């Protein structure tokens, strides 16, 4: 037993830097102790110059967006005991709609904290732990739990209106990809490749569709499942798979258009039919318009676990799992800029609202970043 | 077309007759191209080598297959966490094993077939690169290399849907662990699909013993994050409600035996449902019918849960065979082990009926025997008779035996040798003759146990033993004792025994300091040493007679929470010894639970054994009782509780060992040293009560392997008759009312390497002269 | 075959050590025992055994 | 091992045959299995299997040799010298018994799992009844006379613990199963006084007089 | 090296007690046998003991 | 009453009080094989007599035996059914 824990991939050696912007951080504020090592999406929201936060064990704050001072540091924890308490596992990005703040949890709970003082307005238990973001859609609070269910809560006070059941494989990847609104509908994703198009009012499924190939092996090589970000624009519906091509669907019929296989892992973004992705290897492949050219790609960030793109004024900002912030360009990205080393690792989706560039670390150290 | 000449050119490796018989065509047959296609199919199916071509122009059929290197010289690369033989037997049962003429269209196939095994082990990398180098004359040296990474780690096993019960207490009784600290080791973060189906079963078996009758697991999902390093598991419990037991009515087909079953199925009205008291009632009916001549008892029970009330009414049915005779016993697999030792460890007579519990409880004794690795069993029906069966056991030896040899260093005591061999299996029957040796710079120990456990074969043992001790040491005495002993092993029943036997020992001690505490042993027994010289010696010949009765009702493996255990030992030298005395030793370790939950218990252990000589002669000082240390009275130093010895002006100690001996040695105290380091008196009486509480405060996941406790120790060791003449300048040592209580706290700890016992006591009652010390972290305590 | 186990406690209540069995169940243990030879002294005698399981 | 330098020729089997006819098996076993591993198809491929079985047997090899024999029997069960391969297969089964201890031969081992003696008597009988005009037939009968007696002494030894335990049906069954399997051997005319101590122990004095009518008339 | 006695060959199986049949007395019957039974003599001139040369066939041609 | 150790010793053919009472004269050698079970000891000394012995040694100081001995004639018919429910001492 000389030494265990070897390595196989030996990710990128972090090549040189060509700084031309020198981006700085205006302020920073720690929020409790974050997830640390548990894989769960948790990004900070933003409303009228007030950026919120969250935590997997405790408090959820409402720090200012210009100074960084607390407004209401509610605990939202459980009861106590002899000399210790038990934490409330929270997951799912924070969502803001008016004066409500919905936060899912891993104990089948959905908190509805207020923005005034942080007092919970209503609470209703669901089936299965919540791992997706609560999606506000004309009142409905549709949430994709980690059980293949699409329960759509009400906004006023609980009132679970309707749930839709989806298939689940023997061993699935993740229960992400909460649905999105599309002309009064819900284009949800789902495991095992299937992508449903359930309705908004009651949930009558209009059509389903297969997204990729399977049967490569017993369980491992058929892990393909769309769980990233179902997006719709100009009638075309894209939805990123895990192993095969992404999507080419329609609102009404849903027939398969161009089926470019390039790009199959996480968080595609449409900004004028210029779809940037990462695919099973952390390379920024600026995908084509509709099939073919695949204009350009990157090779310096191979096997360095990155996050969702940010698109900060054209520049494709994206952070890796080591805490670096290598800026990219929009026409021919060759390391336009890069930031210093932010320790503790980056594993959450960086939010790109108007102005600031809030991003949460693996413990919670959100930084407003400018240049 | 009629073929006239069969043309086979080259005949590389396939036999000529095989090539002739593989072709459905011969000389003088009329066929078409379809039969040619069937011949191509046959050449493809024979699997030797298939580069074929067919040409038919005149009167002969020109079918020829080209040779190719398509042998099986597998070699393994530097795999890290996998044994070299597992992949060997895998490829043996599944392909490329020596021969078989592996083709080119199977490399990727075997690569995937081997990668799906690495996936099963739990290493989700599966990087295999297999190349084949061609050697002359149809030979290939296939070499495969592996590029594996770190395996998967069990992440949180958080459960959704559980009420009135914390999430951690449930996982406390689970097998798949998700948080292993350096504190202790109970499991490991390693995924096992077979182990999940046992955890999902023990969860139901644990949640059913409280009255929660309704129980249905909706779904159990298992997932993994991208860049797979962790695995998440989810369990969806649905509790429903709590119910109580109402009726245990029985009905079915019994041979007029309900009169004794209604006494085994009666229940108290109002009792809560118990998920493990029904499995026991079923096994208690499976035994009453088996004891009456029924081999395989079938018992089933369906609970009739009535809604709108807390009532469940079980209905039980039984049916148990006809006779199923078992008149045969065969043992196979044992080598160099007599058959006669295998038939004595089981309770199953040949020619009698079959009992489903006897043939299974015999396997337990065969396993507990010791020199066996795997003991299987099989019940086969003989042809003909429909009831007579044969039971056979398949055993495998373990190759018992050892040879210990150790050498020490210059450790301020001298070089120490050690040599021992027992092998525990002398010749077939199961004798345990062994020889030992602990040759230190002062010690000359040697063991000669020739024990025999089944003489007069009913369960009674009989064992002889010789020994030689030369413990040259100091007291302020160089001893040398050699002898032998032989005792038996009368077994009464389970958790009960009784030993009795004879003995003999000749002991000679010399170079001892004249302390008055032990200076009446010779003055009464013949001798009369002088008060000036010290070189005097003394030796006796003893004829001992030992006896005792054992009792161990612990009802637990190594963490007792109930029961008791008592043992006595004696020794009498009746007919011919130079010193007559008797010494008893009684001690108990009873446990008492305060409630119906094995978490709050209180135990109490006492020790006794007062013994004085008879016949006008005192008891030897080398057989006295010592008390103290972290074993009996925590808070005091090692075995220093008895009466303190004192000397007189006998300072001729013959060139004092320079601080090895003190307190009126050659250069010690001239007058009345008033020694410390007491010597234990004949009498002894200690007792200690101890509460046990759950450990505050750690997570409930691993809060069942600490077992902190609050104890309260006390005891006394006095001498029944010290003196009463003019010795009024020292504290009286004959008063038994000299107890020294010492309470504190004890902290057991099952470390990743064995158990340890931590205890910080505090003696709050002591008299003049007491060696006090704390923080005694003694380990190895498992009794 | 290096297969150390590093056992600790499986008169001495001491001797943390290892078990270096390689070929034929022959070990190379190195115990660190600390025994009481008199009444109150536990000093020394670290040692190493052979453990030939013939 | 060793790098045996066989260019093509049988000059590599010549030195192996010389070492086999030299009282040295362990060194000549690799020299045979190498030629077997690399050329098990040509003219020097039939004799190599027999010469390798003979080298594995004289080297006291484990069931690997039995497997090598069962492989020679499976491929080509037709040979004018086939009676030797069955004799060797029976010989390994017979030799797989005599251990009697860890490393010594001092005690009469006759009651230690006699499953290999029954796995050799069958093959020896099939050999002696199939080809009765061979040259290894005279020793087969002389070996069966001892092998069947050895099973008789195992039956007599397993029918003795039950007569002292107190179960007088098991010894009756084991002597009934011995009087119809090995009647004319030893350890069978001595178990008759052991069936009489049971028939008389169950109040059958009207049925033990028949046993004490063969004991007193069919023996000394 | 646990089996070294019956490898080089020895006269241990030889000089065994012969197989004498058992003749039932007049009036009673014996438990007739089947299965394990010594085949007829089938005598010849083969060597027994250590004189028989345990060797593979000559060439074998 | 030396109470040290004596395991339960039972020897074959567990009989009852409702199974023996069905045997009558001359039915066959077949219904007797399925009414009580196959016999444990026969008489190979040239006769069809079957021995149904029910003997047990329960615990300490106890031996009970029941020697149900019946003999069938040549080719079937039973003629000499005999029952012994007491251990003659």
Numbering used by the authors:
A (entry chain B): 22 to 392
B (entry chain A): 24 to 499, 504 to 810
C (entry chain G): 1218 to 1227, 1257 to 1300
D (entry chain D): 24 to 243
E (entry chain C): 29 to 89
F (entry chain E): 24 to 112
Sentences from the study reporting this entry:
Alternatively, we developed a dual expression system to purify a crosslinked BAM/MBP-EspP complex directly from bacterial membranes. We used our low resolution structure as a guide to design disulfide crosslinks between β16 of BamA and β9 of EspP using a construct of MBP-EspP containing only the last four strands of the barrel domain (EspPβ9–12). To improve the order of the EspP substrate, we then rationalized that moving the crosslink site to I806, which points into the membrane, could allow a more stable interaction. In this improved structure, we could clearly observe strands β9–12 of EspP and unambiguously assign residues for β10-β12. Loop 5 is mostly disordered, although appears to curl inward towards the lumen of the BamA barrel domain. The β-signal of EspP was found to be fully paired with the first strand of BamA, with the side chain of the terminal residue F1300 extending across and over G424 of strand β1 of the barrel domain of BamA, positioned in proximity behind F426. The C-terminal portion of the barrel of BamA appears to move mostly as a rigid body to accommodate the integration of the strands EspP.
In Gram-negative bacteria, the biogenesis of β-barrel outer membrane proteins is mediated by the β-barrel assembly machinery (BAM). The composition of BAM varies by species with only BamA, an OMP itself, being fully conserved across all Gram-negative bacteria. Structures of BAM solved by X-ray crystallography and cryo-electron microscopy (cryoEM) show that BamB-E interact with BamA along its periplasmic POTRA domains and that the complex is overall conformationally dynamic. The full extent of this lateral opening was observed in the structures of fully assembled BAM where the barrel domain of BamA was observed in both inward-open and outward-open states.
